[PDB]
Amino acid sequence: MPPYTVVYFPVRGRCAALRMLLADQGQSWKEEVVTVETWQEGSLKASCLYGQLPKFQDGDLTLYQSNTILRHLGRTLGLYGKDQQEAALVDMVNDGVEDLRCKYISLIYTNYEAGKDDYVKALPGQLKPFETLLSQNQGGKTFIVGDQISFADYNLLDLLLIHEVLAPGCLDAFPLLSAYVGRLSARPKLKAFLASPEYVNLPINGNGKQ
Amino acid sequence: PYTVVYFPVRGRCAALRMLLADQGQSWKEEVVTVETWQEGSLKASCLYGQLPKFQDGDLTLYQSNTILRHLGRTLGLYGKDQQEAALVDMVNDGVEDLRCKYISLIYTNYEAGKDDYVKALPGQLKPFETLLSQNQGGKTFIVGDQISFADYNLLDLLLIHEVLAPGCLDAFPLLSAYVGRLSARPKLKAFLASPEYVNLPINGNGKQ
Numbered sequence: 001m002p003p004y005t006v007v008y009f010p011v012r013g014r015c016a017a018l019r020m021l022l023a024d025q026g027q028s029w030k031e032e033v034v035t036v037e038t039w040q041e042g043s044l045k046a047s048c049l050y051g052q053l054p055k056f057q058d059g060d061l062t063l064y065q066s067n068t069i070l071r072h073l074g075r076t077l078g079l080y081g082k083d084q085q086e087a088a089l090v091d092m093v094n095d096g097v098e099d100l101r102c103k104y105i106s107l108i109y110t111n112y113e114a115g116k117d118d119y120v121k122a123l124p125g126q127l128k129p130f131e132t133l134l135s136q137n138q139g140g141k142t143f144i145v146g147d148q149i150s151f152a153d154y155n156l157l158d159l160l161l162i163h164e165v166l167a168p169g170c171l172d173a174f175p176l177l178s179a180y181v182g183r184l185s186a187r188p189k190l191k192a193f194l195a196s197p198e199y200v201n202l203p204i205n206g207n208g209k210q
Numbered sequence: 211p212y213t214v215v216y217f218p219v220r221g222r223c224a225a226l227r228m229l230l231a232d233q234g235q236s237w238k239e240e241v242v243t244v245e246t247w248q249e250g251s252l253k254a255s256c257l258y259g260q261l262p263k264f265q266d267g268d269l270t271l272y273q274s275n276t277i278l279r280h281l282g283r284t285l286g287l288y289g290k291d292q293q294e295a296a297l298v299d300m301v302n303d304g305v306e307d308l309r310c311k312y313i314s315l316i317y318t319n320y321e322a323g324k325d326d327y328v329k330a331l332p333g334q335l336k337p338f339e340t341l342l343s344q345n346q347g348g349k350t351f352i353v354g355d356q357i358s359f360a361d362y363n364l365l366d367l368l369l370i371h372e373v374l375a376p377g378c379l380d381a382f383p384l385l386s387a388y389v390g391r392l393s394a395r396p397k398l399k400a401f402l403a404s405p406e407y408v409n410l411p412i413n414g415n416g417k418q
């Protein structure tokens with residue numbers, strides 16, 4: 001049996017990046033799907049540390065928090081920079097990704113209709129820091145930090161992919177981010193995963209908005 | 211070695227300052243005033259247009275939790291092994307989640323949202339009491355047997371919530387004793403009593 005288990009709703013959401021990471025690294029894992037019906041029964045929810053999913057099992061280590069899972073896999077799979085300075089830069093990118101993800105999450109679930117045009121208005125200014133980071137690392141031709149992929153690459157890639165669905169062509173203003181999405185998405189195992197039914201047939205979010 | 215660049219408030223620098231002080235580190239405070247932020251020069255120079263900004267030698271970092279993790283990594287406050295490191299992250303991400311709710315209350319909805327916030331507070335604090343309960347009966351730190359950057363961040367979270375809702379730890383004996391215990395560590399005690407902590411407001415809008 002695989003040593004990893006992902007416990008989540010039937011959505012991409014906050015597990016998309018860690019699943020991309022696991023698939024691209026050739027690691028096996030198990031998906032435990034929680035219907036909202038099961039969630040409303042209340043017992044699993046009360047058993048979660050912070051009352052929420054994802055829940056992740058690595059053997060008998062039980063983790064909550066999507067970014068905790070990403071950092072854990074980053075540590076154990078060697079996707080956390082080459083040294084301590086790179087690890088801090090990886091964190092700096094991931095915190096920035098999370099900051100924009102929460103804005104996206106707030107739009108999707110609490111204010112899609114009245115807020116979308118304001119959000120897409122502000123989107124170039126929120127993407128530009130990642131373009132800048134790329135431009136300062138080997139001309140943007142490798143990864144977001146350093147010479148090797150990190151968990152922040154998978155999280156950033158997901159963030160960019162869902163924003164292209166929200167605002168098609170939003171990366172036309174950002175040549176390095178655009179080429180970066182194409183480059184990472186062409187990694188053989190990741191390309192196969194992104195094309196696979198276990199990815200394609202899940203909605204991005206839980207309310208049918210994207 | 212270190213420079214902290216921030217507004218003259220405790221805010222998202224309070225925990226990393228407590229860490230630095232308790233660990234006997236020295237640092238320089240570059241205080242950015244609101245008049246100075248309004249110009250726009252520094253702001254446009256910051257990676258995400260925001261403070262804090264942190265300098266460690268020729269390394270420049272943004273994001274409060276990046277700074278905490280970097281100090282945890284380089285000072286040995288990040289658990290004894292990868293398993294503990296993951297638990298430290300899980301605590302810190304939970305602290306950040308509640309801090310985000312607190313910040314949203316303080317800055318966007320204090321007057322109308324305060325009662326609902328305080329009513330929901332016990333269920334937001336109980337996870338940290340449960341975590342203490344599962345680690346040596348709550349007698350040491352939030353993870354493992356040694357202090358971590360998450361301890362400083364959790365301590366700050368608890369301290370500002372006691373100002374927001376006095377008595378909010380009274381039902382939680384492990385959290386209560388933990389706050390007293392960490393707060394009595396000599397260097398931290400001295401920092402928490404010092405003017406550079408006491409005479410800063412918690413937040414930038416006079417609400418607390």
Ligand SMILES: N[C@@H](CCC(=O)N[C@@H](CS)C(=O)NCC(=O)O)C(=O)O
Nearest residue numbers: 013014051052053054065066067307
């Ligand atoms: N900070 C958490 C957020 C987790 C979260 O918001 N989970 C949502 C779905 S992605 C959830 O469980 N909602 C159900 C509920 O809160 O009752 C993480 O990064 O994992």
Ligand SMILES: N[C@@H](CCC(=O)N[C@@H](CS)C(=O)NCC(=O)O)C(=O)O
Nearest residue numbers: 099221222259260261262273274275
């Ligand atoms: N995710 C960032 C958020 C930092 C943040 O919210 N900074 C605020 C003050 S606490 C700020 O710089 N506001 C002024 C501005 O955005 O121009 C962190 O954790 O450091």
Ligand SMILES: C[S@@](=O)CCCN=C=S
Nearest residue numbers: 013014105106109110206
């Ligand atoms: C505004 S909550 O209903 C958002 C749920 C999905 N994720 C996260 S964080």
